[PDB]
Structure formats: C-alpha cells, structure tokens
Amino acid sequence: AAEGSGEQD
Amino acid sequence: QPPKCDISGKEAISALSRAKSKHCRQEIGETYCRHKLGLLMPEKVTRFCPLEGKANKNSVEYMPANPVRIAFVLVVHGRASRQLQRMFKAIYHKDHFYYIHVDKRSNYLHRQVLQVSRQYSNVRVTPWRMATIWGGASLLSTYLQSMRDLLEMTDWPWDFFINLSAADYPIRTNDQLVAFLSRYRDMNFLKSHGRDNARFIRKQGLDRLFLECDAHMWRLGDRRIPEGIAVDGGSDWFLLNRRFVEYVTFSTDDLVTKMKQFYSYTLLPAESFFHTVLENSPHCDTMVDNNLRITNWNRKLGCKCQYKHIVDWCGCSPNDFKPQDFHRFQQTARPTFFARKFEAVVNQEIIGQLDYYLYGNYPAGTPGLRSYWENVYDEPDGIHSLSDVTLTLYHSFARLGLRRAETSLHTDGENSCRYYPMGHPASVHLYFLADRFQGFLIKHHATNLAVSKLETLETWVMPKKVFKIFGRLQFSEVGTDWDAKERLFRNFGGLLGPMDEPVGMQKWGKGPNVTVTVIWVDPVNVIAATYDILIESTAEFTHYKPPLNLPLRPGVWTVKILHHWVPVAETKFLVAPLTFSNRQPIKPEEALKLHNGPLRNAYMEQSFQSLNPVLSLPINPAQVEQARRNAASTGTALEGWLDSLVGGMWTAMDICATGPTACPVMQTCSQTAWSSFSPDPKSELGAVKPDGRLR
Ligand code: NA
What does its PTM field state (chain A)? Predict the structure, then answer.
C-alpha cells in the first residue's frame, strides 16, 4: 500500500 | 500596522484576509517578506552520505541475551481513554519506557493519563503540550522536543524510539518485538511512499510555504526544493535507534541545521523530514524500507479533502479495521508489529479478536468484555465547553431518569424515590454494547425529598426506534457531522436544535439502479423540501443536506421516502427547543425569536403546498396556533414542552445510585451491568506481574 497523506489543492 | 514589504502574492493575501488575530496577521507578513528577500529558506544543502543512491537493507522465536529497551512516545488526543488504557496494557513491560504527549485541547484525556503516570515509575507525561492539528508543523516540534527530553533522562537507558497514537494496536507480542529489534538494533525503520517521487513532492506540497498559527496551516506561496540533496518521504510512523536520534538532536552540520529550518514551514513535516535527513546523513546505510506497520489505507473512502478548514490543502486518512480484516494480521511476507487505525466507537469486535489472539482469553465470567464507555463531558471542563443544545438535552435526560425513579416504587405512603434536580450534569458517557449504540449515561445530583438528603445518580437513556418500512433500502437516518470515511454520524445521539442543519442519509443494498423521492415534513405537517435522487447500481450510502432557512420549527420532524408515490419507508428526528441561551435560562424575547419557525414563512423559496393533499398531510389550524403559543413560553411551561418531546423519543432505561440511597428499589451503580461505575477489567490497570506484564 502507498504512503503519504497529502493530496493537491 | 502595515507590513515591512509590499505583499502581492495571491495566496498570502488570501491568508491575511482570513486570519482572525492581529498576532497571526503580523507573523504571516513577516514570514512572507523574509521569504521575499530570500533569507528564510535554504537553497543549497550538503549531502554526507557516501552512497550514490539509497540502501534498503532487508526467526523471532529466540531469547536474546541483551534485549533492547524501548521508549514509546504516545501522541494522543480525543476522548477514548479506555481504549488507550487497553492498548497501553497490551504493550506494557516494566523494562520499557512510556512518554505521553496529550493534545493541549484534550484536557479530559490528560487527567486520565496523569493517573497512569502516577501508578508506574517508567511512565511519564510531557509537561509541555501543543495543539497538534492534522498536518501542522507542530508535530515535528513535538517529536524533536520529546527526543531531546528522552536523551537527557539519564535513568532511562533506551535503545529504540517508537511513536504511537491512541488508534494503534500491536499485532504481535512484546517478546517477539524485543527479539526482532534486538537482532537489528543498528537499523532504522522508515517506509517510503513507494510511487513516483516527483508526484510525491507535488501531492505533499513540499514546494509550498506553510505557516502554522492560530491552529491553522496557512499557505503563503511557492518555494524551491533545496539543491544537492535527495528528498524522500512516506509514513510518519517509524522506529529509530538511539544512535540516529542522537544525531538529529545534537548535530550542527549543514544538513541537520538547514532541514530544521526548511521543515519549520512545511505541511506534514514528519512524513519526510526523518526520511530526508537519514538518506543524506552518514547513517544512510542503516535504513530499512519498512516501518513494521500495516496502515488500512482505502483512498476511495479516505481522500475527501476533509481538513480544508484546518489546512490550506487536501489530505487523506487511513480507515478503521473491521472484523473481516483479521486475516490481514496473519501475513508472513514482511515483518510487522503494529497496525492502525482502530476505533472502539466504530468497531470494537476486531480489537477484542486481536487482543485475545495475542494474549489469550479472559477468564469465564469477566464482565464488560463486549461493552464500551466513552466520556463526552466531564464537569471540570465547565458547562461553557458544552453547547446550548447538549446542555439543554442532558438536563432533560436527567429529569427523565428522576421521573422513572418516582414511578418505579409502588406504595400508598410517602414516596422515598422522589427527587429534585440540583445543579448541572457531572459527566456524560456514550454506551455501546457489542458495537451497537445504547445511548447516554448521565451522572447528576439530586435531593431525595423524603429524607431531604443529596444523592448522586447515573441515568441510562436510550433512543426509541423510529425507522419504519423488495427494494434496496436498508436504513434511513437524520443527523449532523457525517463522517464520509467511516459512513456514520459522529453526533451519535442525533442531538439537534433549531439552528442546526440536519442531513438525510440512506443505506442501500445491492440491486439495479433506481430513483426515489425524499420528503421533509416539519412538526405541523408543513412540507419543507422535496427532491429526487438516483440510487446508483453500486451505491451503498447516499446523503444530502437540504438548504433550509433557520430557525427550524421545534418538534418531531418526519422524513419520508417514496418510489413513484408508493410509500417505502420513513424516519423521524427531534429538533429540540432550547432552555438555555449562553448557558443561562432563556428569556422570553429570545425564546420567541428562536422557537417560532423560520423568518421567511417557509424553509425554501420554492413551495410544496400542492403535495399536502396528495400525501394525506393536512395542516390542522389548531396545531399551528398551539405551536405559536409554545414559541413564547419560558421557564416551567417550556420545561414541560421539552420534556414532553424528549419522552416521546427517548426512554429512561434505568437509574442507579453511586453511594448510599434512601430509595429502596434503586440499584448500586457498581452492581449493574451498564453503569460506567461497573467493572471493566479489560481497560483497568493493576499491579505489575512477576513477568513484567499488566495483561
Ligand atoms: Na511515573
């Protein structure tokens, strides 16, 4: 599973 | 006062426009102008790693001779003290260390944590407390300050640093964890994003300047990625050994210095700061691309840009595990020792399965194993931390309980179960049984009028079932604070006042596409809104918030669902009239303007009077008049109107006494099965056992 909690704008 | 430089950036102007405090306005301008002149952010950084790229250096049934001692840093917030106590019981060992940081805004939880730190010598709490908002830069400040404190505690010789929230749980025993880390005590465990790196920088906003102030992350403009280093990132849940924590804390080399400055103005800094420092430091050859966690990512449900009011950015959150996910805790592909997220108010069954599978069943006869209690108001925090809605209704529940006490005793003489309410509620709990909401538990004081003595009591109130019905519809509900990720209302009881904006939710089963009609009806049969909705062939939940002019007419509202005029199902919800204004008894001029329906005679510009005869919903001119008379009432008249509505939608299931009582049919709370005073051994923390464990 991918990591990172940020989505743009 | 004016700024030190001309401010023309669209983003910065937007932040200055939205910032409330003078202090925050100046800090925005100062940061912007410092960055304008180019002496806020570093542009080049030295790399100390001899490797041209990355490392990724890739059984636990043995007994180590020199077992590692772990420092657990728990960063917690919220109300779930009992679930936190349960997890703390599962990970506790007398040879480890536990340093607990409680969000500045979670005072109830902090009081409970202080009782733990006093019982055990290897448990301490941080004296400093920050408001750690999602994505806020204060989270890295929290971790870095805790590392400095932990390194100075001479009496705590720890070898690893592990961070955990109140939503984590171990998926392997402490013995296996110690055996694994003892074998790899020179490694650092960090998980990277595992996708394209350029896109990772853009989605995270690393090329954007953020500033934390007034519990908000303001976006101020663009910035360059520093040159000469490799930027990486991923999960902000890791395990770091003492050697590397020492380097981050005390090193003054070019890399650590310029990264601490860079990441002071960074969104989600803990998700890339430690990755980036390790990769470009002398310790780069120690990284393992695995954080020993399972994170229940479900981005089709968890990426809804749900923090737009806290940060100037969008974000995602992991989901909560359900019982069907238990098999995922048994994989042997890679080593894993913790998982997130778990939430007892969402699903406790999976927590029970995991805990009994690791440490065995509790003995037969143990009470409370399928129950959950969560405190949602504690007296030391003050009635001003409640709203006028919750305060109004918690008072009503207490009176509903006292009325049950009086009517439960049958005698012709004096009634020794007659009470008079005193003061405000002492505490309120949510009560769940086998993952099914049971209602509220209200602790309150009252005078027993027969003996003229004060007593303390707890009342259990439960909401009456209202959803009435081969279609696809499974359930319908009205509430507020809809959680799109977990598909539930976080306002569990459905407590609503005249100024609330209700939301209609529907739950569907598999089946072909259909279209349905929704009807909102106010307490005097006035139709408030009507709309159709396509129920996709794959849809599982639908919801919508109609735009209704306020105030809402108080009373029992009705929501109806039809299919081409064929009735399907219906539900009801209570808009309660308020007895308090600013925590003070409401005055006639206030009750009048609040309880007499919306300003404009109707709720929307469009009218639906043509549908009253079709739906057999006539408007009795007597109710309208009585509703007008009810709108001007105060004091007793208003208290009788409210308690009438509450009694029609809520049931006082039982009431107990916490101490001595004169009512001969009242149970002692500690002897019941539902009271928050009844035994709950699964979350109780006792003496340390000979094996060093609590569980
Ligand atoms: Na202590």
Answer: Shedding is enhanced by a number of factors such as heparanase, thrombin or EGF. Also by stress and wound healing. PMA-mediated shedding is inhibited by TIMP3.
User: Among residues B180, B332, B188, B307, which one has the least CA distance to residue B246?
Assistant: B188
Residue B475 identity: F
Q: Which residues of A touch B267 (CB under 8 A)?
A: 6
Give a yes or no: residue B505 inside a domain.
yes
* Cα B559 to Cα B518: distance, rounded to the nearest angstrom: 7
CA distances from B502 to B13, B442, B541, B553, B569 (A): 34, 25, 16, 13, 18
Q: Tell whether residue B134 is among the known ligand binding residues.
A: yes
B341 is an annotated ligand-binding site residue: yes
Within-domain flag for B550 = yes
Ligand 1 geometric centre to CA of B686 (Å): 14
The structure tokens listed for B564 are 């081409």
Partner-chain residue, chosen from A2, A4, A7, that has the shortest CB–CB distance to B314: A7
Residues 6+ apart with CB under 8 A from B441: B373, B428, B429, B430, B431, B458, B459, B460, B674, B675, B676
Resolution value (Å, 1 decimal): 2.4
Q: How many domains does chain B have?
A: 1
**B568, B561, B536: which is closest to B471 by C-alpha?**
B568
SS3 B338: strand
In order of B71, B500, B528, B541, the CA distances from B520 in angstroms are 55, 15, 5, 19
Element at B625 (helix H, strand E) = helix B621-631
Rounded CA-CA distance B91/B681 in Å is 16
- Put simply, the answer to whether B203 touches A1 (Cβ < 8 Å) is no
Q: What is the CATH number of the domain that holds B492?
A: 2.60.40.1930
> A4 vs B204: CB contact, 8 Å cut-off?
yes
Half-sphere exposure of B9 (CA within 13 A, CB side): 20
How far, in Å, are B104, B405, B444, B495 from residue B428 at the CA level?
A: 21, 19, 9, 14
- The pairing of strands B160-164 and B239-241 is antiparallel
In which domain, by residue range, is B510 found?
A: 473-577+598-619
Collect all residues from A whose CB is shorter than 8 A from any CB in B: 1-9
Q: Choose, out of B313, B334, B341, the residue to mutate when testing the contact with A (most A CBs < 10 Å).
A: B313
- Quick check: B193 and B233 in contact, CB under 8 A? yes
Residue B83 identity: Q
* DSSP track, B144-174: HHHHHHHHH-TT----EEEEE-TTEEESS-H
Contact assessment for residue B258 and residue B42, using Cβ atoms and an 8 Å cutoff? yes
Q: Contact B620/B523 with Cβ under 8 angstroms?
A: no
Closest residue to A4, CB basis, from B233, B305, B314? B233
Residues of B in contact with A1 (CB under 8 A): 194, 295, 297
Which stretches of B240-380 are DSSP H helices?
A: 242-250, 254-262, 273-279, 299-302, 349-359
- With CB atoms and an 8 Å threshold, state whether A2 touches B193: yes
Q: Which of B663, B674, B637 is nearest to B407 (CA)?
A: B663
Q: How far is the CA of B117 from the centre of ligand 1 (A)?
A: 4
Tell me the β-bridge partners of B556: B574
Q: Is B149 annotated as a binding residue?
A: no
**Experiment type:** X-ray
In a domain, B509, yes or no: yes
What the block records as the tokens of B3 is: 């700024």
DSSP for B15-30 reads HHHH--SHHHHHHHHH
**Helices (runs of H) and strands (runs of E) counted in chain B:** 16, 30
The answer to whether position B436 is within a domain reads no
The answer to whether the Cβ–Cβ distance between B315 and A1 falls below 8 Å is: no
Read off the tokens for B421: 């309410």
